[PDB]
Amino acid sequence: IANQPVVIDNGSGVIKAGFAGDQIPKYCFPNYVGRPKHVRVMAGALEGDIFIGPKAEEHRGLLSIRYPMEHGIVKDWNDMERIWQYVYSKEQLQTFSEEHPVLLTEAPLNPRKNRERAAEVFFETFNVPALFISMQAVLSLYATGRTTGVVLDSGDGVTHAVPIYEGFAMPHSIMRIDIAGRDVSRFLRLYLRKEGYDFHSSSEFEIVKAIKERACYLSINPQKDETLETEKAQYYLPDGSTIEIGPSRFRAPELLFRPDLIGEESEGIHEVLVFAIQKSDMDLRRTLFSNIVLSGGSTLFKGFGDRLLSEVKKLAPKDVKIRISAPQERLYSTWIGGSILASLDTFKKMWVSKKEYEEDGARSIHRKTF
């Protein structure tokens, strides 16, 4: 039973889905399970009471949105099961879980208990013939067509750097922080309360993400922007009310480089990228500096790569050629590589079959991933 396998790029913010050997993921929607805040009195209302995908994006104001997945660590399993059931349902894919093998994605250095429970869901609740969990950094390199390179990515949950050299991922040189898009949006929300405009509700949180996506830019010199007075640019909400954002728009994404602002003494994106290159072997460092691949959502800030370069110029050894490559399709780079990995003939050897899982269990899944 070797049908066209399904690639599901998991993540805290957004969940991409689709079939192998496609150019772009056709089925992208945000990873959350909205449930109604108000009491349905009238008949002919929205049926079901559990809303995932575009219906949730259309009817945000009704639904109390809550995310099941934080920092690449699923908290609520019942919600993730309903999301994966929605992916496979007739509203999006129009296929059965029994036909196709699955390609799953997870962030590196996650809990092994979550990986086991992920496999239990796909093998037992859904009746998948073969599952395969893989890393995001390896898939991003598949999408670019490279073999060498450090992979700085920044989704909604996790920011991590994986140094890989000619198809040799170094697990001990991996760095990781739990400071990413969601924490930047949460830090922006807190700053807008200091400005004046509060967005306390859970549906109203999605407005802060929309402000962060559109109206934010990373300044090169933060001390110079702090001394100067801002212009206070405007932004229109979904209602119509105007909002002067002020200095919060540039100070909000600075969380990624300075994680002491939120109150969590970590490295930062630029330090993680240097640390990953430093922890790797001496002869590989110069090739790892030249090949740096960007990915995820929080790399799409304005002047992000300019600041990332300037930070590497500050930290790294002098007279060394830095190159921070960035594709066009940075959000879908992790999915595209999965679709490439799925299409290859080697894919049949990498996966965990259903029969193999029934015999061994979790140990076979831990062996095949690494």
Partner 1 sequence: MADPKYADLPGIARNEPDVY
Ligand X SMILES: Nc1ncnc2c1ncn2[C@@H]1O[C@H](COP(=O)(O)OP(=O)(O)O)[C@@H](O)[C@H]1O
Q: Give me the least distance between CB of 324 and partner 1, in Å please.
A: 5
The yes or no reply on residue 331 touching partner 1 (CB under 8 A) is yes
Q: Give me the least distance between CB of 206 and a second copy, in Å please.
A: 8
Q: Which two tokens stand for residue 42?
A: 């009238």
Residue 166 contact, options ligand X, a second copy, partner 1, none, Cβ 5-8 Å cut-off depending on partner type: a second copy
Residue 2 contact, options ligand X, partner 1, a second copy, none, Cβ 5-8 Å cut-off depending on partner type: none
- Can you tell me the distance from the alpha carbon of 273 to that of 154, in angstroms, rounded to the nearest whole number? 12
Member of 240, 314, 328, 359 binding a second copy (CB under 8 A): 240
- Can you tell me the distance from the alpha carbon of 134 to that of 138, in angstroms, rounded to the nearest whole number? 8
Residue 13 contact, options ligand X, a second copy, partner 1, none, Cβ 5-8 Å cut-off depending on partner type: ligand X
The yes or no reply on residue 32 touching partner 1 (CB under 8 A) is no
Long-range contacts at 61-64 (CB < 8 A, ≥ 24 apart): 61/203, 62/34, 62/36, 62/37, 62/38, 62/203, 63/34, 63/35, 63/36, 63/37, 63/203, 64/34, 64/35, 64/36, 64/37, 64/202, 64/203
Angle at 295 between CA 293 and CA 296, to 5 degrees: 165
Residues 290-329, one symbol each (x = binds a second copy by CB under 8 A, - = not), give --------------------------xxxxx---------
Nearer to partner 1, 94 or 328 (CB): 328
Residue 61 contact, options a second copy, ligand X, partner 1, none, Cβ 5-8 Å cut-off depending on partner type: a second copy
Phi, psi of 302 (to 5 degrees): -75, 125
- The number of residues that bind a second copy (CB under 8 A) is 77
Q: Is 283 exposed, middle or buried (0-12, 13-18, 19+ CB in 10 A)?
A: exposed
Site residues, ligand X (CB under 6 A): 11-14, 155-157, 181, 185, 209, 212-213, 296-298, 300-301, 331
- Tokens 């996790």 correspond to 158
| Residue numbers after which the chain breaks, C to N beyond 2.5 angstroms | none
> Taken in order 56, 25, 128, 367, is the CA torsion positive or negative?
negative
Nearer to ligand X, 163 or 181 (CB): 181
Contact 155, 183 (CB under 8 A): no
The yes or no reply on residue 319 touching partner 1 (CB under 8 A) is yes
Q: Which two tokens stand for residue 141?
A: 């390199």
The yes or no reply on residue 218 touching partner 1 (CB under 8 A) is no
Host H or E run for residue 191 = helix 181-195
The yes or no reply on residue 361 touching a second copy (CB under 8 A) is no
Nearer to ligand X, 209 or 251 (CB): 209
The yes or no reply on residue 7 touching a second copy (CB under 8 A) is no
First to last CA, the chain: 25
Nearer to partner 1, 190 or 210 (CB): 210
Residue 24 contact, options a second copy, partner 1, ligand X, none, Cβ 5-8 Å cut-off depending on partner type: partner 1
Phi, psi of 235 (to 5 degrees): -155, 135
Q: Which two tokens stand for residue 337?
A: 């590589």
Q: Which of residues 35-94 bind a second copy (CB under 8 A)?
A: 36-46, 59-62, 64
Nearer to partner 1, 25 or 72 (CB): 25
> Taken in order 253, 254, 258, 264, is the CA torsion positive or negative?
negative
Residues 297-316, one symbol each (x = binds partner 1 by CB under 8 A, - = not), give x--x----xx--x---x---
Chain positions contacting partner 1, by CB under 8 A: 23-25, 28, 213, 297, 300, 305-306, 309, 313, 319-332
